[PDB]
Nucleic acid binder design. Sequence first.
DNA 1: CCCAATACCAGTC
DNA 2: GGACTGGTATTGGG
Length: 341
Amino acid sequence: MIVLFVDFDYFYAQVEEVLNPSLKGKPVVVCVFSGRFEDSGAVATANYEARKFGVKAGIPIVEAKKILPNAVYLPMRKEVYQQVSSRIMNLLREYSEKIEIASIDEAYLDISDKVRDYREAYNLGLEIKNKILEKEKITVTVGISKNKVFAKIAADMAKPNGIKVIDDEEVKRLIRELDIADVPGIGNITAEKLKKLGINKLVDTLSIEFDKLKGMIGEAKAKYLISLARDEYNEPIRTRVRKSIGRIVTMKRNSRNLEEIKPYLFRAIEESYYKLDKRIPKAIHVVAVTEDLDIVSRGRTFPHGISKETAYSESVKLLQKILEEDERKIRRIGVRFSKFI
DNA sequence: CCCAATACCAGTC
DNA sequence: GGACTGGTATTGGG
Ligand SMILES: [Ca+2]
Ligand SMILES: [Ca+2]
C-alpha cells in the first residue's frame, strides 16, 4: 500500500497570516478566550516563530504572555479556518478516490492505484503541495509510507513546509529507534504510564508481558503499539463519518441555579442544531464542567430522532439530573448529539 | 456472545 | 478542558 498524508502547517495561525499579510514574520498566537476575566483561556495554536519561544497549543493565554508579551494574539475564528480547510480537501479529492479526512487539517490518501512506486509518489506529493500553495497560499507537509501510521510519522518528521518518504528499509529502522511518545494516539497520559515500565520504544512493547501492558494502558492501545512494533499495522483509508456534534459554552459567572444556566445550555442547543445539517440524532448528552474543571454529564437515547424543541426540554431534565448528583457549581455548560439516523 | 447505553478519560487544533 | 471529537471502562439487558 502507498499512503500519502497531508498536514497543513500551523494551520490556524497560517490562515490568519494569509488573510492579514501584516502579520508575516511576526510571532502569532491564536487563542480561545473564555470571556471570564481578561486573558482567561488557552492557546489553540501558534506559528513557528512563536513556538521557538515555547508558546504552544494547550497552555493558558496568561502563561503565553509570560514569554511573548509582544506576540500578536488573535481570537480563534474556527468557521474561517473551516472554509479554507474544506476547499483544500476538495483539491486533495482530485488526486484520489480513497481519501480519509482525519481532522480539520490532515488527510490520508491511498494512491496505490495512482502511482507505481515511492518515487512517483514523491512527485505527486510535490504536485499537491504546489496546487495547495497556488490556490490557497497555504503551505503543507507531506508524508509517504506503507500505512497511515508511518505516513503521518513521515510528516511529523518533515514539518513544516516539507515532504518525506519512509521506505521499507527505514520502517524496520524506525520500529527500533524511535521514542514511543511520538506515536500517534499516544499523549502525555499514555506516554507517562509507559515511561515507568521501562517501555520507552515501540520495540519494548514486545518484551513485556502482554497482560501487564494491557492492564497498564488498556486492550486497545496495547494491541495497537504491538501491531506497530511487529510491523503488521493494517488499517485501510476509509471515509470518516462524524459521529457527534456539540457545543459547550463558558458562562459569565459560575452557578448551580437552573435559571441562569439557560440559554446556553439553550444557546448550545441552537448552535449545535445549525451544525447538525438536517442530520437527526437519537441521543443527547448534556455536558457540564464544574468549578475545579471536572467533567460531569447525563444523557438519553430515544428510539427515534430528536426534534429541536424536544432537545430543549430533555436537556433541562438532563440538566436537573446533574444538578442534584453534584453539589458544586457550573463553570461551563453544553450539549452533545449523537446516534444519527 | 454481543451489544447498547451510560459516564468519565484522552488526544488534537 | 479552551473547545472539540473520539476512546474507554463499567453496567443493564436480550
Ligand atoms: Ca495535524
Ligand atoms: Ca497542523
